Design a protein around this ligand. Structure first.
Ligand SMILES: NC(=O)Nc1ccc(C(=O)N[C@@H]2c3cccc(O)c3C[C@@H]2C(=O)O)cc1
Length: 167
């Protein structure tokens, strides 16, 4: 039994809710919140900008030190950093950005990172300003992630489209 409330169950392990992932992180304080990161961990906009702003820029400060030590992530890769005031940990996951021409097949590799964590609060990878089709992202998520994932979809209209079109 966990504390996520008001989710619709899609499969054995994937749940979805029309919610602001920032507000959901602040209320649940999950072990893991997933960030929709880029390889430089520059949290300027979209989910990443919203999460970083909610940490008063502490996420960005920590991220800049991480990059200075380790260099950029790979598209499809991830790193675990602090969750600050939002979660125990933040899993920064880099989905391909279609608006940069990155290979959409890397989306499955990106979701595989979720399997290293028993339970996660997460957005749909490569959705929003990353330019992929959220319905495709949801399909890859369900077909790749085996651990328990609570997806927060900010847009109500998209949310109902995702629910109404789900197989
Ligand atoms: N307090 C805050 O600013 N919160 C906050 C700000 C921005 C985002 C975001 O960019 N969402 C994205 C989006 C939008 C419209 C269609 C989408 O397919 C997506 C994917 C993303 C998602 O819904 O996961 C999420 C939360």
């Amino acid at each position: 039994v966990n504390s996520f409330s008001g989710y619709l169950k899609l499969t054995d392990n994937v749940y979805i809710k029309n919610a602001d992932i920032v507000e959901e992180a602040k209320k649940v304080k999950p072990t893991v919140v997933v960030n929709a990161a880029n390889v430089y961990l520059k949290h300027g906009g979209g989910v990443a900008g919203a999460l970083n702003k909610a940490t008063n820029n502490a996420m960005q400060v920590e991220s800049d030190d991480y990059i200075a030590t380790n260099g950029p992530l790979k598209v499809g890769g991830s790193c675990v950093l602090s969750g600050h005031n939002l979660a125990k940990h933040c899993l920064h996951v880099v989905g391909p950005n279609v608006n940069k021409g990155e290979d959409i097949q890397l989306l499955k590799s990106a979701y595989e990172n979720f399997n290293q964590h028993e339970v996660l609060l997460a957005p749909l990878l490569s959705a929003g300003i990353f330019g992929a089709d959220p319905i495709h992202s949801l399909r890859v998520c369900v077909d790749t992630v085996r651990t328990n994932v609570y997806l927060a979809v900010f847009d109500k209209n998209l949310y109902d489209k995702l629910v109404s079109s789900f197989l």
